[PDB]
Amino acid sequence: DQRHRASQLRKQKKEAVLAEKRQLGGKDGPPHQVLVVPLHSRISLPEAMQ
Amino acid sequence: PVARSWVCRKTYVTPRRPFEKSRLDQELKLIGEYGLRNKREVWRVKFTLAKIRKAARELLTLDEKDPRRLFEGNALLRRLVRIGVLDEGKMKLDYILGLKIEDFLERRLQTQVFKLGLAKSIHHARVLIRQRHIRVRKQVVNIPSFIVRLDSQKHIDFSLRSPYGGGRPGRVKRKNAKKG
Amino acid sequence: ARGPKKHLKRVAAPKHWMLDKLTGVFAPRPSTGPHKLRECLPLIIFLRNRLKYALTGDEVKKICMQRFIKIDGKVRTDITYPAGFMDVISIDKTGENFRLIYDTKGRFAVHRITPEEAKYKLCKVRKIFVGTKGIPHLVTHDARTIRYPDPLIKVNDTIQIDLETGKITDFIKFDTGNLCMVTGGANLGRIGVITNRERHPGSFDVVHVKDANGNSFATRLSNIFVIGKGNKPWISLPRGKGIRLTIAEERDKRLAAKQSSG
RNA sequence: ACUACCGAUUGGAUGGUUUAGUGAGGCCCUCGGAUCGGCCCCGCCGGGGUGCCCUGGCGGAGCGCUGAGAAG
RNA sequence: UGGUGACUCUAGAUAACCUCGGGCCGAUCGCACGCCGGCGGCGACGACCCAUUCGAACGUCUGCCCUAUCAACUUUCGAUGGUAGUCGCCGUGCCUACCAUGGUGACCACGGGUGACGGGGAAUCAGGGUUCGAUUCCGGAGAGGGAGCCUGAGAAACGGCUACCACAUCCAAGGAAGGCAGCAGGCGCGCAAAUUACCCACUCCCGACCCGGGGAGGUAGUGACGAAAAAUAACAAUACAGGACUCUUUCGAGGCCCUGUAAUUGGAAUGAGUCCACUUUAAAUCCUUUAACGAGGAUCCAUUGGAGGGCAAGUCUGGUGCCAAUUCCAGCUCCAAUAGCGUAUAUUAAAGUUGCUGCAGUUAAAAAGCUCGUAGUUGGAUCUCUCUCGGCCGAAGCGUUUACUUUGAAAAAAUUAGAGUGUUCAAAGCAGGCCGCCUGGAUACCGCAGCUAGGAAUAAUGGAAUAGGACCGCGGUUCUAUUUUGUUGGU
RNA sequence: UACCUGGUUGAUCCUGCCAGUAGCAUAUGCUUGUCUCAAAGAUUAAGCCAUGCAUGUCUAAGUACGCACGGCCGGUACAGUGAAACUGCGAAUGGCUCAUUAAAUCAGUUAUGGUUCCUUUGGUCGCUCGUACUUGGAUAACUGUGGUAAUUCU
């Protein structure tokens, strides 16, 4: 009974986390927006973007 | 499955009560007299002496003609005589219970470099050993806690490459003599 | 497991091989052969650890499969071939011969022998049975079957056998007053004369053996290998003659040897 | 407004003992016989002991005799 | 014939059988070639069986935490036993048929739980104990959950297959593929844990194999888990402050010493670093070894905590509010340990607060109204070796049986204790040492239970009192001698 | 080293528990020059897994007509090296984890006189009274034609 109860709780939490991770960056959600910031002057930003 | 050993031991014990004035004063006395870096070196030598006293009491519980008592007492006495802590005529397990921490401190390399006049002080002796100015019979030793045997007592020599020894001078003396 | 094992961990190896802890996680794992796993010295440990012709196992393989090593007169190129008690190792290139017999501390001594002594070996008889068409067979301690033995040869007796041919040449009975060497238990490596064998039916017999210095020790009947008839061994013995010195006299002998030389 | 309990809804789902029933898939047994080959018969025919026989390659039909054998 | 402690053992003889899904009795491959067409030496590969090795698999005895808010359980559906078989590699209720009604339990069964894989082991340590052991060695179990197979000597195998259950990948929608509790790596979970690196050089393993392969394993990377060693300054002159000693009653003098403190001077010594070259190594890194540069505020700058209530350590300062005391904040001074030091949680020791050693119960936690009253626990004194066969001895009955005690055998390593050994010392390691030689790789402990041989105090136990009790001989009845009736029938 | 300090009362003593103290574990905070060893996704999820790798293998000695190369000597079947493929062996070891599991596992002790065992090692291998100077049919690799979106499909 303890094993099955823990199984139920784990299945609930994993389903919720799966919905949360699939909404972002997938085909049913908005694109994943990445902001690239170079923190130093010697950094070649165009090379990073290529 | 690794081809590694995990055997190791701690070489000291902390005191049971942290702040007792008599123990603190006695430890500070031995630190100052022997030029030691911290309390842990006093605790290390105290641990070695306590282990030797425990072995002596354990062998003293045995009857006189026990082969293990004779063998292990003879080996322990031979080791204590070999590092100069006991005298050769006092090879008896009862005298081990009269040994003090100060004999083990005097058999260090720092103390022997001080007492043989190679150093002007005990702290000069420590910084001399630490800076590769001391050799024991052939071998340059950095370790102040190198316990000297009676056969190596007369071979503490002075490092055939050291500026004060073999003769080739140090960094300051070549830099300063290059000015003029 | 689901089947037989092929690996021997180094700390789980037999202690008398004298392997160390940090060279690897594995030990050489003796092949199946005429000796038990726990009572043999594999050929790689002999040629590398003891005799030091080789520095690695690859050099052991290069030595062995140039066909230089004979065990009991037969060329072996298995580097883990289990060699054990009374086995003759012959290296014809360097002209060396050995018998694997025990030290007084229970370890296989490097015992060099004469090339005429390498012609034969001794075996302890472990079973006598009659096979088909009334043909008597004996089985020795090294998995040798000999047909038509002497009718006087019994179990626990020792045959003196010729390695050129493999036939029975001489034998020694198990009797009170014969010389024996202990090949198992706590008294491994000791040599003495049998003085009393007490019998326990349905159990193990206990043989009492007396040393040449007058010390007495008992073993099981399985641990007794009869070597010589009465008092004179039929093979060469190591530097110690089966005389186990205690730690005190061993320290005294070490100190006298250090005093005499140095 | 917050914290903490009861709770009609057989609320919906899930699991573990069980009553009754169904039961995939393998294994074994009894059948089955798609296909594949040999013998016999005959045809095209080479030689001998001198038309009796057999020698070797190809084809023809015969639920004749059989052997291997898949699905089911 | 030969064997065991004991065989329905091994070997022998007879009568046959010997499976078509079939048991052996060699249509195999290399190298050197030689003697009188015939005779041959090394091997390699196969091979029924027997033994051995490596095992495995079933049994024996003893040993495990909590729970009675689990007291009766097992038994139709095998529970305990018998007989015959089936199946199985074999022993067996393993299964089937017919029988018997049995088997276990307050000495705790059956049931349930465990934040339970078991041991070797670890922390503590006067001793007894208490806590920990997922984890590198040994044994077991499992590969998402169940179940069933094939092949093979060996698997109920999952880096094999076949289903179902739960998930889940591709798709042209017909179909196809799946199993990181391997090495890395990711997500999730969380207080909580490393690189999608190089190599078979070492250790070993596998294969037809000296040659190929191995995320086993080795080597680097991350790594203040933890353990060892060990810098962050030393000295000289000068100036003050003390303490000795000579000379003076003293004050005082000491180119008399010693020891400290320096907003005082002085060059000597070095690592940390930077960086050739070797060495290292599979290739490298590191370490070691060495050139060169490299130290005065040697700024090349040691931290973490605590103190003005008790163990170490405060008659301190300034802001900010309440009615001089008094909330909050920032400092100074001191103490401790030190490349380390605080905090939380759990646990152990202090702890004799779980008490066997070894606690308590008038008045502080706590002894029952009183008597009778199963089991269990506990119980006064007493009791001082032999007979047969074989060479003074060996076999045999033991003497009531124990409990107790001792001995002997047997009993993985690692770890622990401990012997030897200048890893530069040490934690380590198993090495090394001497001018080819000489050595090591000890030893102890290893509860309990079980084998072995002694001991006889202590504590149970039994041996004759209705005598159908010993020790002798005389016996009577019944069964019974394996041989002394040459070969035999024998009442 | 068989050690202690403090907390209830106006004050004294006591029972008693608590806090400090020391070790072991995990975590975390701040700090951190050198060097030697060295644990390291167990605890919660035996939860779920993108990608790559983790098990393959040839000697003189099973099968070589792949010119893929390569010298003869020439009727000399086959020099020799050797991809592929058939055949043999191994893949049941190793590695991981600790979910299960409470006389079960496991430990010590005994037994197989109650069984199997590739391999190694030794024995046995004219012990049978009844085309051989060598037997038969295929099937890979290779050549050639293909199917499916898709596979270590065929």
From Swiss-Prot, chain A:
It is found in: Nucleus, Nucleolus. Required during maturation of the 40S ribosomal subunit in the nucleolus. Belongs to the TRAFAC class translation factor GTPase superfamily. Bms1-like GTPase family. TSR1 subfamily. This is Pre-rRNA-processing protein TSR1 homolog. It comes from Homo sapiens (Human). The chain holds residues 52 to 101 of 804 of the full protein.
Curated annotation (Swiss-Prot), chain B:
GO terms for biological process: cytoplasmic translation; positive regulation of cell population proliferation; ribosomal small subunit biogenesis; translation. Residues 161-180 are annotated as: Disordered. It holds the Pfam family S4. There is a cross-link at residues 92, 138 (Glycyl lysine isopeptide (Lys-Gly) (interchain with G-Cter in SUMO2)). The lineage of its organism: Eukaryota, Metazoa, Chordata, Craniata, Vertebrata. This is Small ribosomal subunit protein uS4. The modification Phosphoserine is found at residues 152, 162. The gene is RPS9. The keyword Endoplasmic reticulum does not apply. GO terms for molecular function: RNA binding; rRNA binding; structural constituent of ribosome; translation regulator activity.
Curated annotation (Swiss-Prot), chain C:
Residues 41-103 form the S4 RNA-binding domain. Its main location: cytoplasm. GO terms for molecular function: RNA binding; rRNA binding; structural constituent of ribosome. InterPro entries: KOW, Rib_uL2_dom2, Ribosomal_eS4, Ribosomal_eS4_C, Ribosomal_eS4_central_region, Ribosomal_eS4_central_sf, Ribosomal_eS4_KOW, Ribosomal_eS4_N. It is found in: Cytoplasm; Nucleus, Nucleolus. GO terms for biological process: cytoplasmic translation; positive regulation of cell population proliferation; positive regulation of translation; ribosomal small subunit biogenesis; translation. Gene3D superfamilies: 2.30.30.30, 2.40.50.740, RNA-binding S4 domain. The modification N6-acetyllysine is found at residue 232. There is a cross-link at residue 229 (Glycyl lysine isopeptide (Lys-Gly) (interchain with G-Cter in SUMO2)). One of its GO terms (cellular component) is small-subunit processome. It comes from the Eukaryota. HAMAP family: Ribosomal_eS4 (MF_00485). Belongs to the eukaryotic ribosomal protein eS4 family. Component of the small ribosomal subunit. Part of the small subunit (SSU) processome, composed of more than 70 proteins and the RNA chaperone small nucleolar RNA (snoRNA) U3. Identified in a IGF2BP1-dependent mRNP granule complex containing untranslated mRNAs. PANTHER family: 30S/40S RIBOSOMAL PROTEIN S4, SMALL RIBOSOMAL SUBUNIT PROTEIN ES4. Component of the small ribosomal subunit. The ribosome is a large ribonucleoprotein complex responsible for the synthesis of proteins in the cell. Part of the small subunit (SSU) processome, first precursor of the small eukaryotic ribosomal subunit. During the assembly of the SSU processome in the nucleolus, many ribosome biogenesis factors, an RNA chaperone and ribosomal proteins associate with the nascent pre-rRNA and work in concert to generate RNA folding, modifications, rearrangements and cleavage as well as targeted degradation of pre-ribosomal RNA by the RNA exosome. This is Small ribosomal subunit protein eS4, X isoform. It comes from Homo sapiens (Human).
